[PDB]
Coordinates of all heavy atoms in Angstrom, one line a residue:
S10 N 0.8 -1.2 0.0 CA 0.0 0.0 0.0 C 0.9 1.3 0.0 O 0.3 2.3 -0.3 CB -1.0 0.0 1.2 OG -0.3 0.1 2.4
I11 N 2.1 1.2 0.4 CA 3.0 2.3 0.4 C 3.6 2.6 -0.9 O 3.7 3.8 -1.3 CB 4.0 2.1 1.6 CG1 3.3 2.2 2.9 CG2 5.1 3.2 1.5 CD1 4.1 1.9 4.2
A12 N 4.0 1.5 -1.6 CA 4.6 1.6 -2.9 C 3.8 0.6 -3.8 O 4.3 -0.5 -4.0 CB 6.1 1.4 -2.9
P13 N 2.6 1.0 -4.2 CA 1.8 0.1 -5.0 C 2.5 -0.5 -6.2 O 3.2 0.2 -6.9 CB 0.5 0.9 -5.3 CG 0.5 1.9 -4.2 CD 1.9 2.3 -4.0
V14 N 2.3 -1.8 -6.4 CA 3.1 -2.5 -7.5 C 2.8 -1.8 -8.8 O 3.8 -1.5 -9.6 CB 2.7 -4.0 -7.5 CG1 3.3 -4.7 -8.7 CG2 3.2 -4.6 -6.2
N15 N 1.5 -1.5 -9.2 CA 1.2 -1.0 -10.5 C 1.7 0.4 -10.7 O 1.8 0.8 -11.9 CB -0.3 -1.1 -10.7 CG -1.1 -0.1 -9.8 OD1 -1.1 -0.2 -8.6 ND2 -1.8 0.8 -10.5
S16 N 1.9 1.2 -9.7 CA 2.3 2.6 -9.9 C 3.7 2.8 -9.5 O 4.3 3.9 -9.7 CB 1.3 3.5 -9.2 OG 1.4 3.3 -7.8
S17 N 4.4 1.8 -8.9 CA 5.8 2.0 -8.5 C 6.7 0.9 -9.0 O 7.4 1.1 -10.0 CB 5.8 2.0 -7.0 OG 7.2 2.1 -6.5
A18 N 6.6 -0.3 -8.5 CA 7.6 -1.4 -8.8 C 7.5 -1.7 -10.3 O 8.6 -1.9 -10.9 CB 7.4 -2.6 -8.0
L19 N 6.4 -1.9 -10.9 CA 6.3 -2.3 -12.3 C 6.7 -1.2 -13.2 O 7.6 -1.4 -14.1 CB 4.9 -2.9 -12.6 CG 4.7 -4.3 -12.3 CD1 3.2 -4.7 -12.5 CD2 5.6 -5.2 -13.3
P20 N 6.3 0.1 -13.0 CA 6.9 1.1 -13.9 C 8.4 1.2 -13.7 O 9.1 1.5 -14.7 CB 6.1 2.4 -13.4 CG 4.8 1.8 -12.9 CD 5.1 0.5 -12.3
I21 N 8.9 1.1 -12.5 CA 10.4 1.2 -12.4 C 11.0 0.0 -13.2 O 12.0 0.2 -13.9 CB 10.8 1.1 -10.9 CG1 10.3 2.3 -10.1 CG2 12.3 0.8 -10.7 CD1 10.5 2.2 -8.6
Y22 N 10.5 -1.2 -13.0 CA 11.0 -2.3 -13.8 C 10.9 -2.1 -15.3 O 11.9 -2.3 -16.0 CB 10.2 -3.6 -13.5 CG 10.6 -4.8 -14.3 CD1 11.7 -5.5 -14.0 CD2 9.8 -5.2 -15.4 CE1 12.1 -6.6 -14.8 CE2 10.2 -6.3 -16.1 CZ 11.3 -7.0 -15.8 OH 11.7 -8.1 -16.6
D23 N 9.8 -1.6 -15.8 CA 9.6 -1.3 -17.2 C 10.5 -0.2 -17.7 O 10.7 -0.2 -18.9 CB 8.1 -1.1 -17.5 CG 7.4 -2.4 -17.6 OD1 8.0 -3.5 -17.7 OD2 6.1 -2.4 -17.5
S24 N 10.9 0.7 -16.9 CA 11.7 1.9 -17.3 C 13.1 1.5 -17.7 O 13.8 2.2 -18.5 CB 11.8 3.0 -16.2 OG 12.7 2.6 -15.2
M25 N 13.6 0.3 -17.2 CA 14.9 -0.2 -17.5 C 15.0 -0.9 -18.8 O 14.5 -2.0 -19.0 CB 15.4 -1.1 -16.3 CG 15.5 -0.4 -15.0 SD 16.2 -1.3 -13.7 CE 14.9 -2.5 -13.4
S26 N 15.8 -0.4 -19.7 CA 15.9 -0.9 -21.1 C 17.2 -1.5 -21.3 O 17.4 -2.3 -22.2 CB 15.4 0.2 -22.0 OG 16.1 1.4 -21.8
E27 N 18.2 -1.1 -20.5 CA 19.6 -1.2 -20.8 C 20.3 -2.3 -20.1 O 21.5 -2.3 -20.0 CB 20.3 0.1 -20.5 CG 19.7 1.3 -21.2 CD 19.6 1.1 -22.7 OE1 20.6 0.8 -23.3 OE2 18.5 1.2 -23.2
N28 N 19.6 -3.3 -19.6 CA 20.2 -4.2 -18.6 C 19.5 -5.5 -18.4 O 18.3 -5.7 -18.6 CB 20.2 -3.5 -17.2 CG 18.9 -3.1 -16.6 OD1 17.9 -2.9 -17.3 ND2 18.8 -3.0 -15.3
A29 N 20.2 -6.5 -17.9 CA 19.6 -7.7 -17.3 C 18.8 -7.3 -16.1 O 19.2 -6.6 -15.3 CB 20.7 -8.7 -16.8
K30 N 17.5 -7.8 -16.1 CA 16.6 -7.3 -15.1 C 15.5 -8.4 -14.8 O 15.3 -9.3 -15.6 CB 15.9 -6.1 -15.5 CG 15.1 -6.2 -16.8 CD 14.3 -4.9 -17.0 CE 13.3 -5.0 -18.2 NZ 12.5 -3.7 -18.4
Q31 N 15.0 -8.4 -13.6 CA 14.0 -9.3 -13.1 C 13.1 -8.7 -12.1 O 13.5 -7.8 -11.4 CB 14.7 -10.5 -12.5 CG 13.8 -11.7 -12.2 CD 14.6 -13.0 -12.1 OE1 14.6 -13.6 -11.0 NE2 15.2 -13.4 -13.2
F32 N 11.8 -9.2 -12.1 CA 10.7 -8.7 -11.3 C 10.1 -9.9 -10.7 O 9.7 -10.8 -11.4 CB 9.8 -7.8 -12.2 CG 8.5 -7.4 -11.4 CD1 8.5 -6.2 -10.7 CD2 7.4 -8.2 -11.4 CE1 7.3 -5.9 -10.0 CE2 6.3 -7.9 -10.8 CZ 6.2 -6.7 -10.1
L33 N 10.0 -10.0 -9.4 CA 9.4 -11.1 -8.7 C 8.4 -10.5 -7.6 O 8.9 -10.0 -6.6 CB 10.5 -11.9 -8.2 CG 10.1 -13.3 -7.6 CD1 11.3 -14.3 -7.6 CD2 9.5 -13.2 -6.2
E34 N 7.1 -10.8 -7.8 CA 6.1 -10.2 -6.9 C 5.7 -11.3 -5.9 O 5.3 -12.4 -6.4 CB 4.9 -9.8 -7.7 CG 3.8 -9.3 -6.8 CD 2.6 -9.0 -7.7 OE1 1.9 -10.1 -8.1 OE2 2.3 -7.9 -8.0
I35 N 5.8 -11.1 -4.6 CA 5.5 -12.1 -3.6 C 4.0 -12.0 -3.3 O 3.5 -10.9 -3.0 CB 6.3 -11.8 -2.3 CG1 7.8 -12.0 -2.6 CG2 5.8 -12.7 -1.2 CD1 8.1 -13.4 -2.9
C36 N 3.3 -13.1 -3.4 CA 1.8 -13.1 -3.2 C 1.5 -12.6 -1.8 O 2.0 -13.0 -0.8 CB 1.3 -14.6 -3.3 SG 1.5 -15.3 -5.0
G37 N 0.4 -11.8 -1.8 CA -0.2 -11.3 -0.5 C 0.6 -10.4 0.3 O 0.3 -10.0 1.4
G38 N 1.8 -9.9 -0.3 CA 2.7 -9.3 0.6 C 2.3 -7.8 0.9 O 1.9 -7.1 0.0
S39 N 2.6 -7.4 2.1 CA 2.6 -6.0 2.5 C 4.0 -5.4 2.1 O 4.9 -6.1 1.7 CB 2.3 -5.8 3.9 OG 3.5 -6.2 4.7
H40 N 4.1 -4.1 2.4 CA 5.4 -3.4 2.1 C 6.6 -4.1 2.7 O 7.7 -3.9 2.2 CB 5.2 -2.0 2.5 CG 6.3 -1.0 2.1 ND1 6.7 -0.9 0.8 CD2 7.0 -0.1 2.8 CE1 7.5 0.1 0.7 NE2 7.7 0.7 1.9
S41 N 6.5 -4.8 3.8 CA 7.6 -5.4 4.5 C 7.8 -6.9 4.1 O 8.5 -7.6 4.8 CB 7.4 -5.3 6.0 OG 6.1 -5.8 6.4
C42 N 7.3 -7.3 3.0 CA 7.2 -8.8 2.7 C 8.6 -9.4 2.5 O 8.6 -10.7 2.4 CB 6.3 -9.0 1.5 SG 7.0 -8.9 -0.2
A43 N 9.7 -8.7 2.2 CA 11.0 -9.2 2.1 C 11.9 -8.9 3.3 O 13.1 -9.1 3.2 CB 11.6 -8.8 0.7
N44 N 11.3 -8.5 4.4 CA 12.2 -8.0 5.5 C 12.5 -9.2 6.4 O 12.0 -10.3 6.2 CB 11.4 -6.9 6.3 CG 11.3 -5.6 5.5 OD1 11.7 -5.6 4.3 ND2 10.7 -4.7 6.2
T45 N 13.4 -8.9 7.4 CA 13.7 -9.9 8.4 C 12.5 -10.5 9.0 O 11.5 -9.8 9.3 CB 14.6 -9.2 9.4 OG1 15.7 -8.7 8.8 CG2 15.0 -10.1 10.6
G46 N 12.5 -11.8 9.1 CA 11.4 -12.6 9.7 C 10.3 -13.0 8.7 O 9.3 -13.5 9.1
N47 N 10.5 -12.6 7.4 CA 9.4 -12.9 6.4 C 9.2 -14.4 6.2 O 10.0 -15.2 6.6 CB 9.7 -12.2 5.1 CG 10.7 -12.8 4.2 OD1 10.5 -13.9 3.6 ND2 11.9 -12.1 4.1
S48 N 8.0 -14.7 5.6 CA 7.5 -16.1 5.5 C 8.1 -16.8 4.3 O 7.8 -17.9 4.0 CB 6.0 -16.1 5.4 OG 5.3 -15.4 6.4
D49 N 9.0 -16.1 3.5 CA 9.4 -16.6 2.2 C 11.0 -16.6 2.1 O 11.5 -16.3 1.0 CB 8.7 -15.9 1.1 CG 7.2 -15.9 1.1 OD1 6.7 -16.9 0.6 OD2 6.6 -15.0 1.7
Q50 N 11.7 -16.8 3.2 CA 13.1 -16.6 3.2 C 13.8 -17.6 2.3 O 14.9 -17.3 1.7 CB 13.7 -16.6 4.6 CG 13.3 -15.3 5.3 CD 13.7 -15.4 6.8 OE1 14.8 -15.5 7.2 NE2 12.6 -15.4 7.7
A51 N 13.3 -18.9 2.2 CA 14.0 -19.8 1.3 C 13.9 -19.4 -0.1 O 15.0 -19.4 -0.8 CB 13.3 -21.2 1.5
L52 N 12.8 -18.9 -0.6 CA 12.6 -18.4 -2.0 C 13.3 -17.1 -2.2 O 14.1 -17.0 -3.2 CB 11.1 -18.2 -2.2 CG 10.7 -17.4 -3.4 CD1 11.1 -18.2 -4.7 CD2 9.2 -17.1 -3.4

C-alpha cells in the first residue's frame, strides 16, 4: 500500500531498457514482505 506495485515497482522495472533485469512479486505481501522474519526466506 506504500509503494503500490502497479504505480511503483512495475513502472520502475519497465523503465529499465539497458540491462539484465528481473521482477518477482510475492503473493499477498505488504510493504515489509521481504524483510527480516518474512515467510518466504527460502525463496
Side-chain angles (χ1 to χ4, degrees):
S10 66
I11 291 172
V14 171
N15 69 297
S16 63
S17 174
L19 273 173
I21 291 171
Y22 175 75
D23 280 342
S24 75
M25 293 188 291
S26 47
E27 301 309 305
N28 62 333
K30 61 172 187 182
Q31 188 161 116
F32 175 91
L33 191 157
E34 178 188 74
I35 300 292
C36 295
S39 74
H40 191 54
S41 55
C42 84
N44 291 5
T45 300
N47 75 74
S48 304
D49 303 274
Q50 290 168 65
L52 165 64

